[PDB]
Design a protein around this nucleic acid. Structure first.
Ligand SMILES: [K+]
Ligand SMILES: [K+]
Ligand SMILES: [K+]
Ligand SMILES: [K+]
Ligand SMILES: [K+]
Ligand SMILES: [K+]
Ligand SMILES: [K+]
Ligand SMILES: [K+]
Ligand SMILES: [K+]
Ligand SMILES: [K+]
Ligand SMILES: [K+]
Ligand SMILES: [K+]
Ligand SMILES: [K+]
Ligand SMILES: [K+]
Ligand SMILES: [Mg+2]
Lengths: 74, 65, 182, 48, 130, 83, 125
RNA sequence: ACGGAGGGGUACACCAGACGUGGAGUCUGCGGCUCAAUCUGACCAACGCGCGCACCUCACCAGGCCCGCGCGGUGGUGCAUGGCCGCUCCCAGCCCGUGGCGCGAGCCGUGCUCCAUUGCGACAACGAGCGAGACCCCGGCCGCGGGCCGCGGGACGGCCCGCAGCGGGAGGACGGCGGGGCGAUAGCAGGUCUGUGAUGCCCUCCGCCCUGGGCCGCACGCGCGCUACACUGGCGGGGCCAGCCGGCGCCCGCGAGGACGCGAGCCCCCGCCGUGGCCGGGACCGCGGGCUGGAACGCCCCCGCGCACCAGGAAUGUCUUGUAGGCGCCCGCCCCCACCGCG
């Protein structure tokens, strides 16, 4: 059979593509997190930035071009 | 401890003055009434809409008495 | 692990954007996207040079295809405007208000410019020229506000300049405050 | 003449600046904490 | 059946029955051994090998379908290691005692090998059920 | 002036009417991925070429970006004998 | 075919009911034994067959989630009649927690202290 | 601006309490002392801070290559500068056009309430804007769709009594939603040139590399912590439950750990010890057996050795619901290694 993996970091575009592929015919969200001090040096009150990159994936099982999405068949 | 800002009030007054006939003094009907775009009202959020409708319902039962 | 591919694409996109900035400063590089590279310029008529010679020679530094749009409203984009200000270094007040006049001509609700560095008599100071309405808080700051910043390598020490534009009535969403009735 | 760099060691540096100190290797970023603050916009990380 | 009876009854009533019929009966290394690296002394009740093996077979019975393994049994009998001036941490138990037990339990046809790990064979499953 | 065949290998990765261009990682394997010569040998010639003007360079993320200019390909045509 | 839920901090008890096993172990033998009267309250304050699978949380939270699943499943066989709306009021008039879940949850830790509200000791010399 | 001036508000700042710290040993940072060097920054808003020093890092010492065996340059100057951060301050504050007052510096705009310059209402001022709020993320309850994720509904001071709003009841998953993100005008000779190909001006040609050493050296005084002083406890055996997401099978070995292959602790129950620095407490030291690595001085395991400590002076800090406290688990820097920080 055939498999389509689709991966993307912006939920809106991913949903648009996922919607308009159903016009032609477990994978949960995992979050890349980095916490880093806000200052370039280490002087002052110790405050921290919390940065987060959330990705999304869908797996279509089978028998529109958007810049930012990733698709692999395997 | 919930004081309505001028933004709620100023929209609520034009809504009550324009649509006096439509608004009963009971709240669900006004919740619908702060939704239509024919009684044109561009509310860009539903919490905002609920607060405006909560003040509109109160404006209704003050003109009767 | 299918995400270790997308992360490297994400990092390579930043590599490419940084190189376009530092090199195509000459044509006013603004932004780029990956998919096949889309570069967003003010004038394509130089990025695609004569006979495309300069363009394709770029397409071989990527191996060690592209196509280009055009920026339609120049004054509303804050990143080629800081470059325009960079070029003129001209009295500071005149250059700042020249930037502001064309930003407002484009139809912006607000715009302002900050300059800081070596102005007079061995003393760092800061000048703030401004016109219209601006915002600085909440979520909408990331949608409707636009900032850009460059350092001018002046004769004396460095001089930093920032340019900010506020355009709320654009093709897109609506500011969660403005509430029209009729 | 043939002794220059015989010592073997990782020389991990930041992909952007070149520093050796405070390099983040999680997820395979390999960039330092000072450069991670300003390049994080386009790499993709955002604050929530 | 096995699931019904108070779990503390079956274990200590089958370990006394582990003295009859020449079942797994204890080897010699039993002396001078701690059941774990977190323990600081050896067990004091001399029937501890009997009760331990009764417990490990009652553990094997509950996982009727799939296979347990030895390293993941020492994890089941884990304890925290104290007296170090640092915060206490958990340690896996000793695999030698458990592997010794399961080896002799693979005899007498009480257990059968699988793809990875031991499994409760129909014989022995019947015995514990009875 | 050290070695000639490497001196011309470094002209292999410049095309005298074609569009290929060179990027360099400034290592300071231990060989440039393009051909197989040591990095130092390419670095010396690139300092020379910049000093004369055979290329224009920018730089970004630890990596030397060069583009062959107008004067440079004329300079090279008499070192590789083309038309 | 009755299907019912019960929730505590992270515990979820899924109940299937047909005209009493907890995770295949008989109810009378739920190991935390000084709290055995709690898992039996709806019975002894108010049979059939029920099957309980509880996961997540801890000992006490699991007990309290089965205390809600059990009492909520014996309210989905009586329907549309005054018993349905009166046994509920009898259950709450003992403990409302018997019908409606407890919303409380762990709060997040904030930087500058070990807990959500406790900070770090301040010194001046 | 300040007042040991008056008036009006307010916050875990106090009240009522809880948990501590300061006393013991010990990890780490600081000062001093020593040293060939023990590289350097900072004194509410410096002192587990500048993301884990055997080499590297590396700025410092003893030697030695290159161009024993311009070009660069973490050189200086943060009181020459950019950018980022901290702080005044998460305070409720700031400010424009036209009119009015004054020679002018300037002024006007700018009582009852709310967390709040949040609003009612009044006014030589009329009319706008920013900050506040709205907004974004998370989590509670219910629907349509897919196979739990992703699209919506839901709460509004809406109902009922008593007097813009303060009270008391009710239903409901939640009652005035809750925890976070963002963050105005004006500034401070805080911090950072040692994070960069940011950088002016000074000075070096102090660049790059290799071997070995130091940053960890110790009469002593301080900051943040860790572990205790026991019976509401220590020990032996058994039972069983998480979330941030996450490999483990088979043999050797007391253990630590190796050769070979494939897809939770607290707590509960049953015993033991018996008020004795005891079986509390585990620092210091003496043999062994391992792991990392080019290299232990790094870390682990085994037997033995069993310090001080009996609840801590004068002082002193934090905190109101799944909260304090107790218990463990994971990630980061990372050859090895947490008494640390983020969760
Ligand atoms: K600090
Ligand atoms: K967050
Ligand atoms: K600190
Ligand atoms: K007048
Ligand atoms: K005047
Ligand atoms: K006046
Ligand atoms: K007045
Ligand atoms: K005024
Ligand atoms: K006044
Ligand atoms: K007035
Ligand atoms: K879906
Ligand atoms: K989906
Ligand atoms: K409403
Ligand atoms: K800097
Ligand atoms: Mg060293």
């Amino acid at each position: 059979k055939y498999t389509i993996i689709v991966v993307g970091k912006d939920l809106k575009l991913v949903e648009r593509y996922v919607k308009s592929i159903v016009k032609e015919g477990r994978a949960p969200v995992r979050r890349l997190t980095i916490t880093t001090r806000k200052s370039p040096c280490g002087e002052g009150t110790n405050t921290w930035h919390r940065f987060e990159l959330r990705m999304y994936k869908r797996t279509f099982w089978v028998t529109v071009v958007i810049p930012g999405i990733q698709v692999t068949v395997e | 401890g919930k004081v309505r800002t001028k933004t709620i009030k100023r929209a609520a007054r034009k809504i009550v003055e324009n649509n006096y006939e439509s608004l009963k003094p009971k709240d669900f009907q006004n919740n619908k009434a702060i939704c239509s775009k024919r009684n044109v009202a561009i509310i860009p959020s539903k919490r905002l809409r609920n607060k405006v409708a909560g003040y509109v319902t109160t404006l209704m039962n003050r003109v009767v008495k | 692990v299918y995400y270790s591919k997308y992360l490297n694409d994400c990092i390579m996109e930043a590599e490419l954007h940084e190189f376009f900035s530092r090199e195509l400063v000459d044509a006013g590089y603004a932004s780029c996207s990956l998919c096949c590279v889309i570069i967003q310029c003010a004038e394509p008529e130089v990025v695609m040079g004569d006979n495309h010679y300069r363009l394709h020679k770029i397409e071989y530094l990527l191996a060690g295809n592209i196509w280009v749009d055009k920026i339609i409203k120049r004054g509303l984009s804050a990143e080629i405007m800081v470059d325009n200000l960079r070029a003129k270094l001209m009295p500071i007040r005149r250059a700042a208000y020249s930037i502001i006049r064309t930003a407002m001509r484009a139809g912006a609700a607000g715009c302002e410019v900050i300059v800081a560095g070596k102005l007079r008599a061995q003393r760092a100071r800061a000048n703030k020229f401004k016109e219209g309405c601006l915002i600085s808080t909440g979520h909408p700051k990331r949608i409707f506000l636009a900032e850009a910043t460059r350092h001018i390598k002046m004769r004396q020490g460095v001089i930093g300049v920032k340019v900010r534009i506020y355009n709320p009535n654009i093709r897109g969403a609506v500011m969660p405050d403005k509430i029209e009735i009729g | 003449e043939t002794e220059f760099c015989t010592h073997i060691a990782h020389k991990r540096e930041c992909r952007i600046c070149g520093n050796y100190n405070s390099v983040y290797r999680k997820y395979g970023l390999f960039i330092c904490r000072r450069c991670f603050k300003e390049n994080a916009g386009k790499i993709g990380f955002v604050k929530l | 059946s096995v699931t019904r009876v108070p779990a503390d009854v079956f274990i200590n009533s089958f370990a006394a029955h582990l003295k009859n019929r020449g079942i797994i009966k204890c080897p010699a290394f039993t002396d001078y051994v701690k059941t774990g690296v977190s323990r600081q002394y050896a067990p004091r009740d001399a029937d501890w090998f009997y009760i331990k093996a009764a417990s490990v077979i009652r553990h094997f019975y509950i996982s009727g379908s799939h296979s347990i393994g030895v390293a993941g049994l020492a994890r089941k009998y884990s304890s925290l290691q104290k007296g170090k001036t640092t915060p206490h941490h958990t340690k896996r138990a000793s695999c030698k005692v458990i592997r010794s037990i399961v080896s002799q339990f693979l005899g007498q046809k009480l257990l059968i090998a699988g793809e990875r790990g031991r499994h409760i064979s129909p014989n022995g499953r019947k015995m514990v059920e009875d | 002036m050290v070695h000639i065949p490497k001196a011309v290998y470094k002209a292999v990765y410049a095309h005298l009417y074609e569009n290929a261009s060179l990027a360099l990682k400034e290592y300071w394997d231990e060989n440039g991925k393009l051909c197989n010569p040591t990095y130092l040998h390419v670095n010396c010639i690139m300092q020379s070429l910049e000093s004369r003007g055979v290329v224009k360079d920018t730089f970004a993320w630890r990596h030397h970006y060069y583009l062959l200019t107008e004067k440079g390909e004329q300079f090279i045509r008499k070192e590789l004998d083309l038309t | 075919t009755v299907h019912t839920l019960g929730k505590k901090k992270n515990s979820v008890a899924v109940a299937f009911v047909k005209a009493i096993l907890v995770n295949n172990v008989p109810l009378a033998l739920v190991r935390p034994e000084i709290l055995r009267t709690k898992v039996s309250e709806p019975i002894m304050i108010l049979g059939l067959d029920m099957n309980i699978k509880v996961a997540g949380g801890g000992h006490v939270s699991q007990i309290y989630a089965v205390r809600q699943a059990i009492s909520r499943g014996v309210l989905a066989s009586v329907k549309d009649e005054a018993a349905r709306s009166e046994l509920r009021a009898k259950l709450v008039s003992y403990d409302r927690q018997l019908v409606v879940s407890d919303p409380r949850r762990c709060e997040a830790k904030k930087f500058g202290g070990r807990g959500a509200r406790a900070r770090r000791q301040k010194s001046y010399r």
